Amino acid sequence: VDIIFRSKLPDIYIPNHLPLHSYCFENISEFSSRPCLINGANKQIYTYADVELNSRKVAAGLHKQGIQPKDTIMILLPNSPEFVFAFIGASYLGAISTMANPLFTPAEVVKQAKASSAKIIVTQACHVNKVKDYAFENDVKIICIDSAPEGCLHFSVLTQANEHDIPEVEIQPDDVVALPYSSGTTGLPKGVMLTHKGLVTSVAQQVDGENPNLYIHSEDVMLCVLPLFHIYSLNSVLLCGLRVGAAILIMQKFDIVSFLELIQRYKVTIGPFVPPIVLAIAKSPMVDDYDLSSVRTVMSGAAPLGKELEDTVRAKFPNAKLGQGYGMTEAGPVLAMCLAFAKEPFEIKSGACGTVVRNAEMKIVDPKTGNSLPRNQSGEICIRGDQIMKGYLNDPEATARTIDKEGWLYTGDIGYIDDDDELFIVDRLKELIKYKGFQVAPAELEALLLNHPNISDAAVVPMKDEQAGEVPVAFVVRSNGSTITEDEVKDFISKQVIFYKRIKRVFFVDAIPKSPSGKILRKDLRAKL
Numbered sequence: 001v002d003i004i005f006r007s008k009l010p011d012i013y014i015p016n017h018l019p020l021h022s023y024c025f026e027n028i029s030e031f032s033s034r035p036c037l038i039n040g041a042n043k044q045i046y047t048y049a050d051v052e053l054n055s056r057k058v059a060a061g062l063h064k065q066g067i068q069p070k071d072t073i074m075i076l077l078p079n080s081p082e083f084v085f086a087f088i089g090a091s092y093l094g095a096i097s098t099m100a101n102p103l104f105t106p107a108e109v110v111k112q113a114k115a116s117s118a119k120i121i122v123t124q125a126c127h128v129n130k131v132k133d134y135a136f137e138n139d140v141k142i143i144c145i146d147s148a149p150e151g152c153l154h155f156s157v158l159t160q161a162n163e164h165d166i167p168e169v170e171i172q173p174d175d176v177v178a179l180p181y182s183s184g185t186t187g188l189p190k191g192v193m194l195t196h197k198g199l200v201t202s203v204a205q206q207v208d209g210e211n212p213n214l215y216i217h218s219e220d221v222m223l224c225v226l227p228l229f230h231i232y233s234l235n236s237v238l239l240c241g242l243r244v245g246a247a248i249l250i251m252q253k254f255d256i257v258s259f260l261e262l263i264q265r266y267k268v269t270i271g272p273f274v275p276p277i278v279l280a281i282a283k284s285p286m287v288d289d290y291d292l293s294s295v296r297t298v299m300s301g302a303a304p305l306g307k308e309l310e311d312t313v314r315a316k317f318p319n320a321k322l323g324q325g326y327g328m329t330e331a332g333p334v335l336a337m338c339l340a341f342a343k344e345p346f347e348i349k350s351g352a353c354g355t356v357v358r359n360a361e362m363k364i365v366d367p368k369t370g371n372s373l374p375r376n377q378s379g380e381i382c383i384r385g386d387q388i389m390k391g392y393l394n395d396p397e398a399t400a401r402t403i404d405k406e407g408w409l410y411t412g413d414i415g416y417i418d419d420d421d422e423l424f425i426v427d428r429l430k431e432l433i434k435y436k437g438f439q440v441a442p443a444e445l446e447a448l449l450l451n452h453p454n455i456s457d458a459a460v461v462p463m464k465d466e467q468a469g470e471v472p473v474a475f476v477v478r479s480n481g482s483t484i485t486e487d488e489v490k491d492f493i494s495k496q497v498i499f500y501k502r503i504k505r506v507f508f509v510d511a512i513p514k515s516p517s518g519k520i521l522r523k524d525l526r527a528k529l
């Protein structure tokens with residue numbers, strides 16, 4: 001029998017039959033006049049009323065541009081009010097938003113645009129070159145938020161639309177609303193189908209209930225420095241923030257001076273961070289010149305944090321509850337959330353990534369035997385609940401390998417739960433690399449390397465790194481007679497991928513360590529490092 005773990009919080013009612021926009025704005029009349037989005041770039045503020053209205057106008061505009069229920073738009077933007085209006089606008093139509101890093105290479109963007117069947121790409125003028133040819137050849141509309149080059153529309157064409165022209169629509173709970181890309185537990189990036197039901201469940205798991213797991217309210221100011229095109233910020237910052245009526249302070253990029261100035265100036269109360277930001281706070285000489293006493297909650301997620309950094313956060317944020325959250329795109333994303341963040345807080349331990357969310361079930365499974373394990377024994381973390389993905393777009397085979405027929409999502413993460421129901425992640429079974437919290441899929445890089453006429457075989461694995469947590473390193477077997485150097489390999493990759501996917505070291509070997517079956521012995525390679 002499976003040994004099942006649950007939250008220390010009781011199950012709650014979740015209205016996951018509601019469309020995401022209906023749920024997120026359910027209580028809007030209570031904070032209609034309150035600030036919703038604060039743009040750190042220009043200090044423009046939009047109220048809740050504004051955000052709901054603009055989203056509805058954008059929905060009408062998108063419909064006029066040809067977006068029907070179940071159609072897809074691609075958002076190719078930095079953190080911005082426009083990102084938000086496009087995302088919520090598509091939700092109103094029963095449509096889907098796929099989101100991507102605006103700094104992706106042309107090849108990377110086009111691959112995702114093709115895979116997702118995006119009908120419209122929303123971007124900035126400076127990135128039109130990345131998609132122009134593809135979009136013209138395929139009649140994909142390009143909408144720019146700043147200035148429209150030839151053959152593009154301005155975002156104003158969406159906001160000019162009348163909110164009363166939103167068509168009648170019957171959105172179902174299992175309808176897809178968000179399509180972030182993730183490589184999951186093996187292979188290439190795949191389209192993660194996140195539904196209305198799923199996202200409502202995940203948000204509720206965090207912020208709803210008499211004692212919410214992550215207590216945020218309508219007087220909080222939450223920093224949005226994490227990218228909205230990734231699921232952490234999208235769900236835990238934007239969607240959770242909207243649900244409770246919090247102010248969301250948008251930053252387009254991390255800059256230490258801007259970051260500190262904004263926290264001090266706006267009296268930021270919620271800090272959703274990743275370990276590299278925590279590291280910058282611990283290391284920077286200018287931090288001592290700032291008043292960060294306003295921050296009451298500091299969360300780190302997306303990558304391991306560790307004891308040394310956890311300590312200096314305490315010092316630099318004297319009034320904050322500090323802890324971690326643990327998410328995975330396929331999981332909706334949140335699996336576990338620090339209970340020190342609760343309205344009535346629980347005691348926590350350093351290095352824990354939280355307690356499994358309420359209205360969910362967790363088990364720990366030995367990868368060798370398939371046996372579910374008791375407390376204080378490490379194995380693969382698995383989760384079940386309404387919050388998880390519907391599956392991978394156009395990939396039933398990968399879905400079947402990732403979520404079993406009893407509804408269990410296998411994360412590829414190794415951990416244990418202790419006597420206080422605190423989850424600790426100790427290792428990663430899956431091949432995924434995390435550079436500053438960003439996914440790096442080795443399979444993508446390995447495919448590129450194997451394509452080089454002077455490379456016979458290759459394996460990409462994480463190497464531990466202070467600044468980035470992990471960096472991608474390549475083990476390369478040269479073809480016979482090949483003289484390709486470390487820099488030549490690095491350059492070959494650097495010309496084809498976004499910066500964070502770059503190979504930082506190349507180790508040349510006679511053979512890639514493989515199992516008898518020929519699967520890369522990644523654990524063996526990590527051990528060599």
Ligand SMILES: Nc1ncnc2c1ncn2[C@@H]1O[C@H](COP(=O)(O)OC(=O)/C=C/C2=CC(=O)C(=O)C=C2)[C@@H](O)[C@H]1O
Nearest residue numbers: 232236301302303304324325326327328329333353425
């Ligand atoms: N706290 C963590 N400690 C160690 N590893 C972590 C942690 N969080 C994520 N990971 C590793 O990243 C993988 C998922 O990559 P992904 O890029 O799919 O997803 C994320 O990272 C999302 C993390 C979130 C964190 C929050 O606190 C939150 O509120 C909402 C989301 C996952 O399978 C782990 O290997």
Ligand SMILES: [Mg+2]
Nearest residue numbers: 170171172173
């Ligand atoms: Mg319905």
